[PDB]
Amino acid sequence: KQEPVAAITIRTNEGEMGVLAGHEYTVQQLAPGILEVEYEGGKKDQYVISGGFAHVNDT
Amino acid sequence: AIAYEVTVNGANLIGAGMAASGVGVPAIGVAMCFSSYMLAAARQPNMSAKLLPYCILGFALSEALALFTLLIALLELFVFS
Amino acid sequence: AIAYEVTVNGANLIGAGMAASGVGVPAIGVAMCFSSYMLAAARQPNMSAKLLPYCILGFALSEALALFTLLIALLELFVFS
Amino acid sequence: AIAYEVTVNGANLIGAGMAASGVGVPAIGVAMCFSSYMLAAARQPNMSAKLLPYCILGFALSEALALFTLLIALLELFVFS
Amino acid sequence: AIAYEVTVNGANLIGAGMAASGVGVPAIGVAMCFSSYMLAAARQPNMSAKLLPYCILGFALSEALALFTLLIALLELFVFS
Amino acid sequence: AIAYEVTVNGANLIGAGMAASGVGVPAIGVAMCFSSYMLAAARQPNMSAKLLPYCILGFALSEALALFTLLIALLELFVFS
Amino acid sequence: AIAYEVTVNGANLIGAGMAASGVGVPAIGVAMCFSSYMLAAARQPNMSAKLLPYCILGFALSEALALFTLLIALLELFVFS
Amino acid sequence: AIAYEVTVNGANLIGAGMAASGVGVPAIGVAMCFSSYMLAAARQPNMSAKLLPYCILGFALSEALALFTLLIALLELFVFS
Amino acid sequence: AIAYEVTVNGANLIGAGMAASGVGVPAIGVAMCFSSYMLAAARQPNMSAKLLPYCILGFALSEALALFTLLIALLELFVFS
Amino acid sequence: AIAYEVTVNGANLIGAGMAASGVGVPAIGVAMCFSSYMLAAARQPNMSAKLLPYCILGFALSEALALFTLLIALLELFVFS
Amino acid sequence: AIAYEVTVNGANLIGAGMAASGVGVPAIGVAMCFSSYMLAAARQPNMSAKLLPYCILGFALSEALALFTLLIALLELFVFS
Numbered sequence A: 001k002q003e004p005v006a007a008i009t010i011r012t013n014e015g016e017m018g019v020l021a022g023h024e025y026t027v028q029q030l031a032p033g034i035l036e037v038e039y040e041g042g043k044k045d046q047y048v049i050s051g052g053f054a055h056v057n058d059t
Numbered sequence B, C, D, E, F, G, H, I, J, K: 001a002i003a004y005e006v007t008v009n010g011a012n013l014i015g016a017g018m019a020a021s022g023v024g025v026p027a028i029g030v031a032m033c034f035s036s037y038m039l040a041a042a043r044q045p046n047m048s049a050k051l052l053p054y055c056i057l058g059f060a061l062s063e064a065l066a067l068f069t070l071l072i073a074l075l076e077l078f079v080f081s
Helices: B011-021 B027-043 B045-078 C011-043 C045-051 C053-075 D011-021 D027-043 D048-075 E011-023 E025-043 E052-078 F011-043 F045-075 G011-021 G025-043 G048-077 H011-021 H026-043 H045-077 I014-020 I025-043 I045-077 J011-021 J026-043 J045-078 K011-022 K025-043 K045-075
Strands: A007-011 A016-019 A026-029 A034-038 A044-048 A053-056 B002-008 C002-008 D002-008 E002-008 F002-008 G002-008 H002-008 I002-008 J002-008 K002-008
Touching: A007 K045, B011 B045, B011 C011, B011 C053, B011 I014, B027 B045, B027 C011, B027 C045, B027 C053, B027 I025, B045 C045, B045 C053, B045 I014, B045 I025, B045 I045, C011 C045, C011 C053, C011 D011, C011 D027, C011 D048, C045 C053, C053 D048, D011 D048, D011 E011, D011 E052, D027 D048, D027 E025, D027 E052, D048 E052, E011 E025, E011 E052, E011 F011, E011 F045, E025 E052, E025 F011, E025 F045, E052 F045, F011 F045, F011 G011, F011 G025, F011 G048, F045 G048, G011 G048, G011 H011, G011 H045, G025 G048, G025 H026, G025 H045, G048 H045, H011 H045, H011 J011, H011 J045, H026 H045, H026 J026, H026 J045, H045 J045, I014 I045, I014 K011, I025 I045, I025 K025, I045 K011, I045 K025, I045 K045, J011 J045, J011 K011, J011 K045, J026 J045, J026 K025, J026 K045, J045 K045, K011 K045, K025 K045
Parallel strands: B002 C002, B002 I002, C002 D002, D002 E002, E002 F002, F002 G002, G002 H002, H002 J002, I002 K002, J002 K002
Antiparallel strands: A007 A016, A007 A034, A026 A053, A034 A044
16 A cells, blocks of 8 residues: 555566556556566565556656 | 860759758658657656757757758859859 | 860759659658647647647748758759759 | 750750659658548547647648649749750 | 750650659558558547548548659650650 | 750660559558558457458559559550650 | 661660669568568457458569569560660 | 660669669568567467468568569679670 | 770769768658657656667767768768869 | 660769668668567567577578678679779 | 770769768668667666667667668779779
């Protein structure tokens, strides 16, 4: 819930995407697979997912 | 052998046509430089201010080659006989 | 060597037909500007008012080379002997 | 040098064949403008009416250079000797 | 100088091939007009009819340039000596 | 002034190849139209039927200019000496 | 005027290379046709069978103009002396 | 009229390099073919194997046109005197 | 065979425009280098810095070729007779 | 008629530049072959390893023409007087 | 026939402007590679390291041909009479 994070890498139907702060406003599906996350401390967190919808914002 | 030195004054204007033919090619980069800005500000209004100097940069440095082509057009004629 | 000065008058009108070929080349870049303007206006119609100033500029400056490319053909005949 | 003036009347007719070749290259910009109007309507149908004056404007000014290019090849022949 | 009028009669036929090179160029715009109509129709079948007007107008006033170029390529031949 | 009428038999066959350059340019517009039909079927296969007439039609409209550019090529040789 | 008919045997061959410039242009429409079929089946493999007919039809119809582009040179050389 | 039969042996070679100019044109269809297969693979790894034959088909049938475009120049020099 | 050496001063001013016609082409890549950066900025503004070294790198080298393309036109005249 | 055979040593070089014009065109095929491998690799890094075979080949065969195009110009001079 | 061996020194310089037309074309493939790396970097910043080898490499192999495209232009003047 509203954690500060440095970066995130999704898997979608069109392909594999990555996101940073102030990425372009977009919304899209999530392919059934893995999701990578990278905090500001250099560590990582992987989550297996079952579909979904990513909602990225310009803010 | 036999030596002939020929000076074709009609060549004073034949190169200018081919030079003028390429004057309009950099235009292809002008709108392409502007188009990316139009989409960019659409995709992100917040960044429209920071991208405009680079549209001006690539625009002027694209139009410079047409400038020097027109310079060739002027130099081919107004100094040569 | 023998010295032959030759002057081809027919070339006064050839290079105008060569420079004419480049007058249609800015057309694709002139159309490209409005072509991308429609896409950015569709992505964010509220930016259309913000975008048409950044659209007419290159639209003229892409068309401007055509004038520079077309004036040559106009300048090539009515002044040359 | 010895002075040979040569007036080539066939040169009056060849150059138009080049200007005529410049009449095709603006057509792609016309199709680019209407292709943009179609994709924009597919992106924003209700916007199609407010984007139409810019489609007609890019159509007209894209056709303008084609018109001058077409004008030259005819102005090359029926007046020149 | 010595005055040499030279009338080149094979030049009646060379230039017609030059224009003939350009007669194919509007073809690349033809499908550009229909392709968007295809994709926009696939993107929005409800707008299939409302863009067919500019689907025909983009071909008509694009093929008109090809027709003019072809009218030059034939006009250049069947009258000029 | 002096008057030399020159009739060139070789000009029968050179400009013919100048026409052949315009014969390949419609092929890209044809494949563009087929590609548009393909991607249209990729987006909406049920709309493949309503869109196929626009593909069968636009192909022939692209191929007509290829036929004309070929017509000038073949008409340039078998009649002109 | 004085009448000179010239028969140029080198004109037998120059235009051949001109047509040769256009022999590779259809290959881009070929690659565009196969590229379109690739991405189409990449979006709809089930429909790949119903798109293969137009994937080979576009190859045939591009090869037809490629063969004509070669036909003009082959007719320009193998018979004309 | 007077009949001047001229044989231009340098025309053996001038058409050669013109034929060479179209030798690089197929390379764009080549790289477009492998590019499209690359994107179709990324879009769908499972369909990588089905699209490979169609990815070699236009690749080598474009090389057939490139081979002929080089064969013209190779057959132009060392057989014609 | 009779040996005839000829020196053409007309060709000093002709190749200049021949090289000038190619000076327009790198300008497209210039905007192509900027255009990507623009979208790359809007897609990920944090990468705006990381891609600016790649922008000037792709830009200057493009213009470097244009300089070379321009350089020949400069070298063709002010030293050659 | 009269038989005038001519050997043009200048024609040993005229076609060379046109062959050289085709030398830079396959360079697009290089980047077009590499750029896809970049983008698809970004879309699926885990698959990039098995996409490299399609990157080396399209470049390699793109160079096959590029060298053969560079072959003739190099062959155009040193064997032909 | 009557054998006129002719050596045209003007042809020493004409091709210099011809090959220059080929110098500008690889410049677009430079930005075609840099735009590739740019978009792939915005696609996945962490993959920026793995695609960088193919960027400069893809540029070099393009610029290399430009050098050869430039090499003849420098080999055309500094040695040939």
